[PDB]
From Swiss-Prot, chain A:
Belongs to the small GTPase superfamily. Rab family. The gene is RAB27A. Regulated by guanine nucleotide exchange factors (GEFs) which promote the exchange of bound GDP for free GTP, GTPase activating proteins (GAPs) which increase the GTP hydrolysis activity, and GDP dissociation inhibitors which inhibit the dissociation of the nucleotide from the GTPase. Activated by GEFs such as DENND10. The keyword Glycosyltransferase does not apply. The chain holds residues 6 to 188 of 221 of the full protein. Keywords: Acetylation, Disease variant, Disulfide bond, Endosome, Exocytosis, GTP-binding, Hydrolase, Lipoprotein, Lysosome, Membrane, Methylation, Nucleotide-binding, Phosphoprotein, Prenylation. This is Ras-related protein Rab-27A. Disulfide bonds join 144-209.
Length: 209, 212
């Protein structure tokens, strides 16, 4: 078991990199958010796909905590399909280990998030079932009582082993008022649609300020 | 080395510390919340200094901090002035992070540097080794504070032990000057300078804050 020196140095590396990044943003605005979910659901894969278009299938469980950036451009996303001239958005995309060994390390990074990507594994029902607790965890620890969440039933490319019925998943999302997307980190289905939704939900919350 | 992962109990603690923090923060979403953070080697006096500060009390049993905690104290801060021009009393809600010191908690404690507008660095006067590591703490603070050239006050703690004092006074004033930081010699037991150092830190933060 016992946590090793080499793994802490990586985490100090991520931390050292975040601390550097914040010091510089000091684009148009920096929009931070955070992906979480049981481990082995594709947080890293999903984010990797989204940023780089690639996908490794070797499972490399996240060493506690990591983050990525995309310099995307956000546009209006207005009513009945409008689009006013949109902004530059530096993105920061936290990736949390879903394991026990880091439940208390990852939960400290919620404070830096402005939205959330809650992931489950369409091929693993317990991923789906534990989704309620994850949401509980987010109201309890995020920095607004009703934090913006987009849910993702990831691994949509593995139909011959999909045990979560879209009915049950849409029903869970409707019960909380959270957008649902079924996603694949293999081939990128809805990977863009889903995080951009969060971005809209997040950017629109700032124009309520 | 062989650093143990957090037991569930250990993680139980820290999760409710976090839960505590979340509420505090959300609640403040007639004041001015100010935070800072205690750090330095294990056993140098970190919690005790803070417990002396908030409750005017001291406990002899070493109760090593399980990763992270924080204490609060309401206070009134009045501006400094060029000819004793002390300004209006500001209510200042104070959150005081107490970080562990054992290395096995290093990356958990460093996470919280983004929440701390200043740092209270402790070594022990009865332990030169703790005093020697202080350079590496400042280097860890330059590296991971979310503002650069961050505000630090350095505390030589345990000053009420003079038969056990080993850190020469001059070596510390030296350091504190080379790095240009306030140095205080403190006692978490009798309370000598505890208040003065913490008041100094908030002052720095306060003046630093209104650079605008
Ligand atoms: N077919 C398919 N496999 C995927 C997809 N996303 C991840 N996987 C696979 O599922 C496993 C889990 O990947 P990973 O990104 O590490 O998941 P994670 O939830 O971030 N793990 P951790 O929480 O430990 O960081 C890997 O073997 C990966 O290749 C996806 O969209 N489709
Ligand atoms: N005589 C004396 N004892 C002190 C003083 N400050 C702390 N102590 C004692 O020395 C030990 C230091 O304990 P404590 O300050 O709680 O540890 P800490 O700095 O928070 N380290 P940790 O990272 O393990 O939580 C305890 O036994 C405490 O009671 C002081 O000024 N004088
Ligand atoms: C939970 C999600 C939700 O639904 N709402 C929600 C909850 C929390 C947060 S937030 O706490 O993370 N947050 C607000 C904006 C940025 C940051 C902040 O406050 N300050 C800051 C200031 C200066 C610099 C700096 O980086 C360099 C950062 C945002 C949205
Ligand atoms: C607070 C301590 C800390 O840990 N970090 C930290 C330190 C300083 C600042 S500072 O911007 O305010 N500042 C500008 C220069 C120094 C200092 C100042 O005002 N006067 C001064 C003090 C000593 C010698 C000296 O040379 C003539 C001048 C901000 C953060
Ligand atoms: Mg991962
Ligand atoms: Mg302590």
């Amino acid at each position: 078991s016992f946590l090793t020196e080499e793994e802490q140095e990586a985490i100090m590396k991520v931390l050292q990199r975040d601390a550097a990044l914040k010091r510089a943003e000091e684009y148009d605005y920096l929009i931070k958010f955070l992906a979480l979910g049981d481990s082995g659901v594709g947080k890293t894969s999903v984010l990797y796909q989204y940023t780089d278009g690639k996908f490794n299938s070797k499972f490399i469980t996240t060493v506690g905590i990591d983050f990525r950036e995309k310099r995307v451009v956000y546009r209006a996303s207005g009513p009945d399909g409008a689009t006013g001239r949109g902004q530059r958005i530096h993105l920061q995309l936290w990736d949390t280990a879903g394991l026990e060994r880091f439940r208390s390390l990852t939960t400290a990074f919620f404070r830096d998030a402005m939205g959330f990507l809650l992931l489950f594994d369409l091929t693993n029902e317990q991923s789906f079932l534990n989704v309620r607790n994850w949401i509980s965890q987010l109201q309890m620890h995020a920095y607004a009582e009703n934090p913006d969440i987009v849910l993702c039933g990831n691994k949509s490319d593995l139909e011959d082993q999909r045990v979560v019925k879209e009915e049950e998943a849409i029903a869970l999302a409707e019960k909380y008022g959270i957008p649902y997307f079924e996603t694949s980190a293999a081939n990128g289905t809805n990977i863009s649609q889903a995080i951009e939704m969060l971005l809209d939900l997040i950017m629109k919350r700032m124009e309520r300020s």
